[PDB]
Each structure stands twice: as structure tokens, then as C-alpha cells.
Amino acid sequence: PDIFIKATGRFLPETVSVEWAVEQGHYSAEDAELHELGGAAVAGDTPAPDMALWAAQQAVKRCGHRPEDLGLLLYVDSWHQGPDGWQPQYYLQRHLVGGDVLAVEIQQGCNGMFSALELAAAHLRAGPRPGSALVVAADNFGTPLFDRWTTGPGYIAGDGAGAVVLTTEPGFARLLAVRSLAVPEAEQMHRGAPGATIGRPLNFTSRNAAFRELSLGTGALMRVHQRTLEVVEKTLSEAGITLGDITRVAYMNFSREIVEQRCMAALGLPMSASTWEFGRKLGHLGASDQVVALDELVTTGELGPGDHLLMLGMGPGVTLSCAVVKVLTPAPWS
């Protein structure tokens, strides 16, 4: 059973450059030289559920799909969306999809989009013949317990939202394969407390520093690098292609050094084939870095018929997910 991507959409607010951040004293001058970043998309007071609604509407309106025809809604995120005891997917269920679908919030850090693609693809295959599913990501890091500039090491957090409409019937693109491996031994990399949940602020740099200070074996990082290449080898094998067939690579919007060494230099591909130039100005958009990169490559016409995109992403777990999207025809909105 084939799973086709009918359409994709996003919402990106106004970008704040690093030169501005350096002047006010939010971002460091040395870090601006160390990480050659462009900027970060800042929403401000716009809720993340609203940003997801804008991205979902564009994806639906692009291909001319009916919101009621959807059989699944997967809202993914890595940070608080709204009030506690209330999930964000009901907002899209009210103002778009309708209450005759399976709406459910996914959470797996920045790799939540990859897991949603697996669950959505499995849901469509098991379901009826004419099926369709909506997968969306959205986050607003402009909050009290999150500093977009200094929280994450090697990247600047950004606000926005990504969307994608999967379907059983033929479309412009096709999801060939998508995997998700993990190194659970390095699960302490993204924490350092578990008795009391909320209260303290977020800072991945200190949590990574605390994890690096003490390890039982400490061959986690190397097994993480092994499992980075393993999941890519597995995804390409399932998709039925080689690394030579890959046209572009969609890694997260981390520092130029990190994107070069960990992703592109590991696979043995040039930095021109990455989505770094575009991604640098946007920053790390939670779990929307590869779908917004796919959107930009598809919409502009850089990724034409016959080409393959290699979506890769490492997140908390540490979980390493890889996906392969093939463009069959040109997009109906380009």
C-alpha cells in the first residue's frame, strides 16, 4: 500500500536576526561567530494552536481537500501549547477538521513529526480505501520558562508551524519509507532533576553538561553516531534506493559546524545539498525543521519530479528518525 503526500503547508512569523540579539545582550557575540546562524522566527503573543491552524489551512487549501474527509489528526509539539488539562488538537477540530476524526496529541521532542508520519501511514493502510490524514507541528518558545537564544546548545529556537496531508490516493509526492531508532542509554542527556515536574526553567546546555560529566559505559555518543547511520541505511533499504539517488538532505537547523560534521560529513555529502542556508534564518522550529524544508524545496521548484529528499533528525531519547520523500509530479501550487 502506497502512502502519498497530497500537500504541505507552514506558517512562519517575522524573523529576528542575530545582529539584533547581540546588541540587546540576549545572544553572545562569540556564539554568533561560532554558530553562523541567520536569525530566529519570533511569533510573540500568537498562540501555537493558531499557528498550527494557519499551516493546516494552507495544506488543505493547496490541494483542494475537504477537512471533513480526514480520518486522522496528529498534533505534534515539544513545548507547552496552552492551558493545562486541555490539548491543542481540539482547536483545529473546532475551526477546520470537525469532530468526526481521531484527534490526538503526539509528543517525541523534535522527532515527533517522524513518529506521526509512521502512525499516520499505518492508520491509512489499515483503514478504508479512500483515506486521508493531517499531521501538524507548532510551537511558541516565547515564554517565561524558555530562552530561545541560550536554552539549546548549537541552535536558536524558533516559532512557527509545519503541516502535511497524507493520503492513500495518488498525489504529487510519495512517502517511500520512515523509521525511528533510539539509544535509550542516553536518555539522561535531556534531563537533570523527576519527583516534581514543573517549576524549574529549561536549559539543555546544562543538562548536556551534567550528562557529559558522568557516564557509567560512556560509549553512548558513539552508539548514537552508529545509530544515525544505521537508521539512514534502514530507511534507504526499505524505500528501495541508494544514497546516490538522494538529491537534498533535510536536517534540523543547528549550527553550521554541527550540521556539517554530524549529518553531511557523516553521510559523505556536500553542504550545498543540505537545507542549511534556508534553515539558518528560521532557526530550530521544534519539530518542523524538515517539513518546512520540504515545503520550501517543493514550493520553489528546487525539488522537481524524480528527486528524493532525505529527512533526518536526532532528538531526546536519544531517538534518531529518518524518512525518504519522493517527488513524482510538480506541486499543484507552484
Add this chain to the structure above:
Amino acid sequence: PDIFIKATGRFLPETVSVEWAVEQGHYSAEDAELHELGGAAVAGDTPAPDMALWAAQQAVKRCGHRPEDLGLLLYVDSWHQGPDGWQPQYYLQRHLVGGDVLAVEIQQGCNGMFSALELAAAHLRAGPRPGSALVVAADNFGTPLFDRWTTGPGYIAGDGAGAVVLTTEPGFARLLAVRSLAVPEAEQMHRGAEPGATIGRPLNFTSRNAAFRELSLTTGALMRVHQRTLEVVEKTLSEAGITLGDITRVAYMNFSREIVEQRCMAALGLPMSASTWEFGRKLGHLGASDQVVALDELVTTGELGPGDHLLMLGMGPGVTLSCAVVKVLTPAPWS
């Protein structure tokens, strides 16, 4: 394709009585007489991921399953688990399942278990022939920003965890059907009057529901909820291939007797003896574990034997209305 329940497991800490709560001044005497609840399961400083790890291991060890053969892990929850920027399923991934599965956190209030059963059933059907999936729920409502006694109207929150092991191959029970309808017009019931800022304030569903009734009393939202409550039960029974007469027991949430009787049992036209209220009232509302822990208790004690059916009914944020039917084929391999 048939989706069988291989086994089920749970964890329930020491139950604090309602009479104790009235003496200390946490729970009012009026609500004690009105709701007629027994008590609530209270964990001290035990994390919810640990509580899920107990329930997961129990369900796995009961049927003699090996954790690595699982092809899916669905961790569901209604409230915070641990540190932010870190999901709880990785804890079970290290100390049980392993990093060769699709681990992912589900969130849909108290009906998150029902949605996980749909996604797990669909994942097993679409996947290979021999398959198995672990679905688990776990929550700890022990403050700061959550008063277990006064937060929820008509129910006392309780700590614990519920587990269930789905599979393609034959088992002791069978998941006949499971669905989830929603009335998105009443999504502001649990939101109330505050969206821009995410955190800082405490959770209090009574004031959130109270604020919604002012907005409602200024479209027929509540009648739609009551309509779609009976609709999802009708369609789940129709999908399962049975009638309401075939239902032996019913598993509703552990809310007050007045709520459990009127909204669920009186609505379906069944007696309160057929509910799981006598057992559930002691434990309280276990986030999204009320129906599976009720499934567990009925299975191991021998009250729900071969040929019987269990009608799991839920109502959560959305407002989402989920219903499921579980048929016991043979006696459990662990009782």
C-alpha cells in the same frame, strides 16, 4: 484482522480514605456525603514513569512476552510526568522494551487510552503478521499545581498506572471495536476563561466548567454531548457485532455516584450493580486508567469470565466521547 489483548497490568499505591481527608481539612464534608466516594490512591514522591514501569512489567510478565518483540509503545497521560523537554516513554524504553520500537507519548485527557487502542490496533493491522504493541497510562496528581480533592468537579484524582498488551496472535481476550467521536463546539469547557501564556496558574476544572456554563447560557452544546454519548456506544456495539444485552459489565470513569448513575448507567438503561463503581470509588480518577484498571480487576478476580463482554465508556476534553468493547474468550493465564 483480529486484535487480541495478550494481557493487562496495573499499579495502585496505598489508598487514602475519604474520612481521613475530611479530618485534615482537604475534602469537604458536604462533597463526601453528596458524591459518596470511598477514597483515592496516593503515591508519595514516586514518579509516573516508574508507576508505568511497574504496570508494563506486570502485563508483560503475566503472559510470558519478551519486551523486545514489541513493535509499538504508546505512553498516555493527562498531566505532567517529569522534566520538560523530555518524554516518559524513554524511561520504559531503557528499563524494559528497548530502542528498537516506535515509542511515542499520547495525550487526549482521560480518553487518551481509547485513542491509543485505536492507533495500536491500526499499527498492528498494517504491520507484519506476527505483531505486538504495549499501551500504558500513568499519572501522579500530588501537587504543586493540582489539588487532587478540589480540582476536578465530581471526582477525586488518584495516582497509579494502567497497562495492556495488544497482539495479532490469539490471546485470552479480544478487542472487538473501539471508536472516538467528539463535540468540538464544547472544547472551551475544559479551557474556561484562560491562552497566550502557557504556565504559572494552577488547574481547577470546577471554575473552568463554571465559566463555560456562563458562555453556554448567552447553541445546544450539552445536548450534542449527550446525543454523541449514546451515538458512539451504538456504533461501537454495531462495529463489534453485538447488542446492549450482550454487555455483562460497564467500565465508566471513577466519578461521583450521581454522575456515574445519571450520565452513563441511567442513560444506557442498565443497573448500577453492572458498573465498576464499587471498585473504582476506592481508587478515584486515575487520569486515563479508570477503564483498563477496571478491565484488569474484573479479569483477574474471575467476575468477567469466558463469553462475557465489557463496555468501556469514556468522556474527556474535546469534549471527546470514546467507547470500546472487550470480549473475554478464555480465562486469564495469570489467575
